[PDB]
Design a protein around this ligand. Structure first.
Ligand SMILES: OC[C@H]1O[C@H](OC[C@H]2O[C@@H](O)[C@H](O)[C@@H](O)[C@@H]2O)[C@H](O)[C@@H](O)[C@@H]1O
Ligand SMILES: OC[C@H]1O[C@@H](O)[C@H](O)[C@@H](O)[C@@H]1O
Ligand SMILES: OC[C@H]1O[C@H](O)[C@H](O)[C@@H](O)[C@@H]1O
Lengths: 664, 664
């Protein structure tokens, strides 16, 4: 009654929903459907409508006034013009006088023209009319989001250590590199739980190998780190290296587990190893084979992983390379100025992540071949699903850390996502903030961005402000590209400021983890737009640089360089709280309305809502050492908080022993 | 006395200053000077210091927290990481407990590490200790800037028609193209005074020609437009096409007016026309010759010009093309994967605006040969100088519209600048805003940005917001790149809103013109940071998204997509004014403090200071038709305003009849 499914043509089964909804019979209940030019849904919005959703996509929380195309794309330059990033999250809510949610279950290129062409017109369109459209009804947008969260299945739940702080760099290669990271944090008493291992840890970029010269006793080294409460989190990519003798490659060939050209040859895509093949993520037996290979790492002590390049990213194909070389030969011989350097330049760019390559290979789904572009947005999803389903077979009682770059709705059951290759730009703090609630609407709660900025060179103050937002995001990882200025906390003067900010994270871990688990187990949102909590406050509904967290707090990060504070709007009385660098917590009651608040570079702010409180632990240097027996309670007198707490390792969620009421 | 000059080595004479300052012989008064590896000035800032200046450079009004390299560079992607744009404006003010200004008079690559390396450290460095450093003392930053304005000479002053609205696009080619722009504005009663003619109006991109097929009788087409109060503003580029029979080329070759390679041959750089030569802008005889060629256009009724590619931009040189072809040949025949596509791609990138090419040509300076890289930052400056000096020769009493892309301090006397190739990004509204006061500090008052965003695709709301900031910038011009979504005001629905917004411009022209003229004639600022007007207010000094204009008003544009208002800080009581879509003017007294103000898309807001007022004309569709006889005064009863007005055409600036005192 509250969700209806409208079927068009013969849709590929994405497995996004875990609940079966019957196909509806009536006319489509909103706007107009046309099949003249492929498929197009057209809706005239009211002037005051706000459009929420789209998970990981560009720009802001209110999606009105631009174009967004669902088409998982490896693009490391997240500027305002960009229409497609890594995630295809096809859920939107029109919120206004007439309110409703739509989920377009369609696995290929889907274009949301949300007031781009004409301010009052929403147009969603695709090439083929083979899809299911879920219409979700409800009193308000938050109600609709919650009904959607129910039908898509419970969100991935990480192990508790994954609520600590993590440090990654594309470049850590040797034991010395990793030991220097360990020392730089530990000797400076800066809290940390995780060090990420990027591609250089493998033998020549081969999946499910480790470099034999650098790590001849990898299990010893994993334990060396683990004994210090540092969990190594290695990367796995989609491309399996073409190499004679390499068992992952031999088996994929012999057993037909790779994506193939139409003629049945194994399709070649160059990535880090050079020539690779792509496991056929849409073939259940190839999925199981690939997933089971994680055993190689789990058996050495590894308790978490991350996946990149799973769009799948393609540096070039063999076809593209040959074309590019042919064109280069012509340009080289050109003595008549007919081939301009810009055309040579365009061809070199065109061979990367080419739409032509995405039509050159196929998925074998139970004997039936489907051209990749027709199901492009399912690849990363199904790669992460291969890993999650494997973890269940390998150790069903245990939570593993898992997150991915590319994703589609349904993947949120098996892994988190990080926001991909961002930049050391102040505008990317705000971008990180704004994606959060949208990711929550689509079931992806375990999420975060590369703190300090992945690409380009950070500054001390930019990294501090990034970190102060990261305090609140379930994934809190400082990560960086090769060639960039080093951005570990210990690379800067006055390291005490970094200690202070990260201490605030650890002091809030019990609260944050508790809210995560409550949200996940109840199909609810960890971050929410203000309008979800204050539906009747016309000013609240349009705030976009603050977020509600749980039912107790609101966050409002500073994202302007040189700012000593920022403006906020409080839709009710709250206590303005800051974690101070001397270890103390300042508190000030602020009334409903507009305020300017002072927030220094080494201070972490939040607001506790009227009639609420939160527990705050003493600072500890790893998750395991956090003392949750004797936590102080901050907020309003006479209020109470329900703390969710478990062993953070296993899957025993239902128990009454997991909850205790704390009373201020 | 409050300015001293410190000379190192044998500086090249840039002519930035018009006032002579004696060489100081005492100790350098601030920080430390090193000559150990080229030149470095190093200063330890107090934690509260603000650093102003740097004219057109990246990021914010307070320059602390990043690295700025003065190195005029053709880069059309103005993202936060960029260290060099088009402008080389070597003037900064340290403002705090200790306050002083520095102008670094040096014509080559100059690095300002302003808290990038260490937050507390300002370091300014260059490869050769051959420069003058001017140290300016004063009570505060505003006083230091006025002293600098005096010594660099009076800023360029435009004709009054240049305070209308202007429209341009890379693509307008034929007479019908221009007629349709004219028709699109005039038939919808949208005020306009100027249409810009980009490179397609030339015959095959040849400077100082006109496409004689499309314009058989150009003077009559100029008149056709002028009778409608529409003045065509044609572009001229740095590169003169290599073509036998083309007079400009033949004259430059014959008389050795082009920049030469080391062997004496005329240096070849490819730009729009394919092969070109650059006029030797540092050679006085070459400057006079090139500047004299503007006669070709003036004689046909043209009253204004713009200059681009004056860095000078180089798509490739003959040397660089040959290197890239040789590389391409190697790539093409590579079978063993030794030459990666990304290397090929990097070579093609490397040949554009190449540091190597800037070392391949020379200027003939009064007989002395100087390698171009040594004086790189003077080229665009001298090209605009050439136009300006020729105008004074052609008609000394007439003001011409003139602005350029690249510049160096000194150029501000001969023309304005526009802010180059920006983007249809919301963040570029704020970038347009922030650059303004900094440009004023450096003498560049006639400035503005491409309204709506030059590159990428705009949206209706973004254009309206850019325009509402355009209302206040001396250059108010909607301009777009080829291939972009069309962004003339008539391309959008509900064009009344576009009328309303531009109407506000024309209603304020008498005031804005008045303030520009008073400022220009007195070596003062048109736009000021709040800290210049309210130096004792610790809140005001840190505001960057509001500016003071003149002595009467404050501006505070909306720059967030979907926003229906914004936060503002008023350092004193002001009247919050809005030009309303129906032609009325709303008025609200707001006290000193933090406020949220509602500004709809089709409303243009401003604030009138306590005890001040401004004259407001009735709306008119061109500058010539504005009725200034009995303008309405808006603001505080009992205040007065001094109105400057002249004929707008000539240079009769020192008349007492020019000033009229208006009392509310
Ligand atoms: O494993 C290294 C790196 O991979 C991913 O980012 C890789 C990219 O590098 C670029 O320079 C390229 O321009 C992008 O298009 C790439 O995908 C991953 O996102 C990152 O976290 C890893 O460190
Ligand atoms: O203004 C012309 C501009 O066009 C853009 O397409 C180029 O990439 C810039 O480098 C160039 O100067
Ligand atoms: O001339 C074509 C283009 O060249 C460059 C200029 O910055 C831009 O304004 C112009 O449109």
């Amino acid at each position: 009654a509250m969700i209806r499914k409208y079927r068009y043509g013969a849709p590929f089964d994405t497995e996004a929903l875990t609940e079966k909804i019957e196909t509806a019979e009536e006319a489509f209940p909103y706007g107009e459907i046309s099949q003249k030019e492929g498929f197009a849904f057209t809706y005239i919005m009211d002037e005051d409508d706000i459009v929420y959703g789209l998970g990981e996509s560009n720009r802001g929380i209110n999606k009105r006034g631009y174009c967004y195309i669902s088409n998982c794309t490896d693009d490391p330059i997240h500027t305002e013009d960009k229409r497609s990033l890594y995630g295809a999250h096809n859920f939107i809510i029109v919120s206004g006088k007439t309110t409703f949610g739509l989920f377009f279950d369609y696995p290929s290129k889907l274009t949301f023209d949300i007031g781009y062409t004409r301010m009052d017109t929403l147009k969603v369109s695709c090439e083929n009319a083979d899809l299911d459209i879920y219409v979700i009804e409800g009193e308000n947008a938050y109600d609709i989001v919650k009904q959607f969260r129910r039908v898509i299945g419970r969100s991935y739940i990480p192990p508790k250590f994954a609520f600590g702080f993590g440090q990654s760099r594309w470049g850590y290669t040797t034991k010395e590199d990793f030991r220097a990271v360990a020392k730089g944090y530990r000797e400076n008493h800066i809290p940390i739980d995780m060090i990420y291992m990027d591609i250089d840890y493998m033998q020549d970029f081969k999946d499910f190998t480790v470099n034999e010269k650098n790590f001849p006793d990898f299990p010893e080294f994993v334990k060396e780190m683990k004994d210090q409460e540092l969990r190594l989190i290695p990367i796995i990519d989609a491309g399996v290296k073409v190499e004679k003798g390499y068992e992952v490659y031999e088996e994929g060939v012999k057993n037909n587990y790779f994506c193939k050209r139409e003629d049945g040859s194994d399709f070649v895509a160059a990535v880090w190893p050079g020539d690779t093949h792509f496991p056929d993520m849409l073939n259940p037996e190839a999925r199981k084979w690939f997933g089971d290979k994680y055993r190689f790492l789990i058996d050495q002590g590894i308790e978490g992983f991350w996946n990149a390049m799973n769009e799948p990213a393609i540096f070039y194909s063999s076809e593209g390379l040959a074309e590019a070389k042919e064109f280069a030969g012509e340009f080289a011989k050109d003595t008549e100025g007919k081939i301009h350097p810009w055309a040579m330049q365009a061809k070199m760019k065109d061979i990367v992540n080419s739409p032509e390559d995405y039509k050159r290979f196929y998925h074998n789904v139970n004997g039936k071949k489907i051209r990749h572009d027709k199901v492009h947005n399912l690849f990363g999803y199904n790669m992460t699903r291969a890993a999650g389903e494997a973890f269940e077979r390998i150790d069903p009682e245990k939570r593993f850390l898992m997150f991915s770059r590319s994703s589609y709705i349904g993947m949120h059951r098996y892994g988190g996502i990080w926001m991909g290759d961002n930049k050391s730009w102040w505008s990317h703090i705000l971008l990180n903030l704004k994606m959060l609630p949208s990711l929550n609407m689509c079931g992806f709660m375990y999420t975060g961005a590369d703190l300090g900025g992945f690409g380009d060179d950070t500054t001390r103050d930019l990294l501090l402000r990034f970190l102060a937002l990261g305090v609140f995001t379930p994934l809190m990882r400082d990560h960086a590209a090769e060639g960039t200025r080093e951005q570990e906390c210990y690379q800067f003067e006055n390291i005490e400021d970094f200690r202070s900010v990260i201490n605030a994270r650890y002091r809030l871990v019990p609260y944050l983890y508790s809210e995560y688990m409550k949200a996940a187990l109840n199909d609810d949102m960890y971050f929410k737009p203000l309008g979800f909590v204050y539906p009747d406050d016309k000013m609240a509904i349009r705030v976009e640089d603050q977020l509600m967290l749980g039912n107790e707090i609101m966050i409002a990060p500073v994202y302007e360089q040189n700012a000593r504070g920022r403006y906020v709007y409080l839709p009710e009385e709250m206590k303005f709280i800051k974690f101070m660098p001397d270890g103390s917590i300042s508190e000030e009651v602020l009334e409903k309305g507009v305020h300017y608040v002072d927030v220094a570079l080494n201070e972490v702010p939040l607001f506790i809502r009227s009639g609420k409180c939160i527990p705050v632990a003493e600072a500890a240097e790893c998750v395991k050492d956090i003392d949750t027996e004797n936590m102080q309670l901050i907020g309003y007198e006479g209020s109470s908080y329900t703390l969710y707490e478990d062993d953070g390792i296993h899957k025993d969620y239902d128990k009454k022993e997991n909850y205790r009421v704390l009373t201020k």
